[PDB]
């Protein structure tokens, strides 16, 4: 801040008018997924929220429509995944991976 | 109390899901008639071209219109190939709902 | 387990079997088609020679 | 004579185009199978046939 001893020419940096007078310490006071960025089908705001919030789905970047839940029904047995609909596959991508819509018996009475 | 609380959520999910299913069936019937519409525009460009081949000698001279219609038929054909792939995508998202509509109704 | 490996092995063969069925019948048509295009333009060249 | 030749050519060509269309839709009908997801319920398709 320009002080008294430096002189008049130093008192040109802060611009003020008669409007600004009266303020204490007289000088003018000084100075994450966004939707602006383009996104495709599986990338959206909800996908940004699809992990922090009480649902814990995390994208697998190799196969974009394959999300992983953090809370798996049986970590002792091999992992399981969820499948996003739509999507598209190239060069046959041969991975036979668990998908699970619900947890229970293999042949349910109430279906 | 836990039994009741899960049931109410199950019914709320089903109601919002059968909203989307019926609504999504709208966009399928709009996609199909546009796909049928574009095949009429392809028929025009073919008919526009072969009639212009009735020209002869200096009538048969090539021009901007002939080259312009050349670029129309190639581009109109690629649009249908793009749209046909997009139609089959929506039908997949419909079928995923039906399987998952049964499973919410399975446990209610 | 052995009935599981035998069943799981059968599916992996069928995945190749249908992917075989798609690719060959895709390949046989394009070769059949491209031969007729080359067959078409050969006839036009010969006929223009004759007149 | 030229006019007649051209006229019959257009009629026969329109027959050809119709056959192309019907061939394509019959090919995809043959391609349809019970695992496909394009398949959907179209009631009255049995009742209303013309």
């Amino acid at each position: 801040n320009p002080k008294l001893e430096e002189g008049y020419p130093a008192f040109r940096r802060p611009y003020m008018t008669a409007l600004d007078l009266g303020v204490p310490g007289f000088f003018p006071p000084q100075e994450r997924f966004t939707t602006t960025c383009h996104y495709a089908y599986p990338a959206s705001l909800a996908l940004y929220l699809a992990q922090q919030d009480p649902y814990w789905l995390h994208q697998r970047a190799d196969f974009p429509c394959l999300m992983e839940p953090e809370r798996q029904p049986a970590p002792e047995v091999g992992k399981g995944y969820l499948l996003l609909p739509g999507c598209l596959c190239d060069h046959h991508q041969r991975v036979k991976v668990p998908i699970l819509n619900r947890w229970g018996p293999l042949m349910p009475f109430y279906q | 109390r836990e039994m009741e609380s899960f049931y109410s959520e199950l019914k709320w999910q089903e109601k919002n899901t059968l909203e989307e299913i019926a609504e999504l069936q709208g966009d399928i019937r709009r996609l199909e008639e546009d796909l049928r519409r574009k095949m009429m525009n392809l028929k025009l460009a073919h008919t526009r071209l072969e009639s212009r081949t009735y020209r002869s000698n200096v009538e048969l001279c090539r021009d901007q219109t002939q080259y312009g219609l050349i670029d129309e038929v190639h581009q109109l054909e690629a649009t249908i190939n793009t749209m046909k792939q997009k139609l089959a995508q929506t039908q997949n998202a419909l079928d995923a709902l039906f399987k998952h509509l049964a499973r919410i109704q399975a446990d209610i | 387990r052995h009935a599981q490996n035998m069943r799981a092995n059968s599916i992996r063969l069928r995945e190749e079997a249908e992917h075989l069925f798609e690719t060959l019948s895709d390949q046989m048509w394009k070769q059949f088609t491209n031969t007729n295009l080359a067959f078409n333009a050969r006839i036009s060249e010969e006929t223009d020679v004759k007149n | 004579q030229i006019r007649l030749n051209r006229e019959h050519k257009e009629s026969c060509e329109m027959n050809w185009s119709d056959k192309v269309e019907v061939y394509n839709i019959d090919d995809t009908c043959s391609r349809y199978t019970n695992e496909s997801t394009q398949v959907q319920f179209y009631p009255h398709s049995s009742k209303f046939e013309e």
Binding site: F63, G104 | - | R7 | -
Partner: peptide
């Protein structure tokens, strides 16, 4: 037992697994 993660019929390949792609004919 947990047969919904180990059965050889629950293991479906992810993505659309070479979804229907065929060009128009003729």
């Amino acid at each position: 037992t947990a047969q919904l993660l180990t059965d050889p019929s629950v293991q479906k390949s992810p993505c659309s697994v070479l979804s229907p792609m065929t060009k128009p004919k003729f």
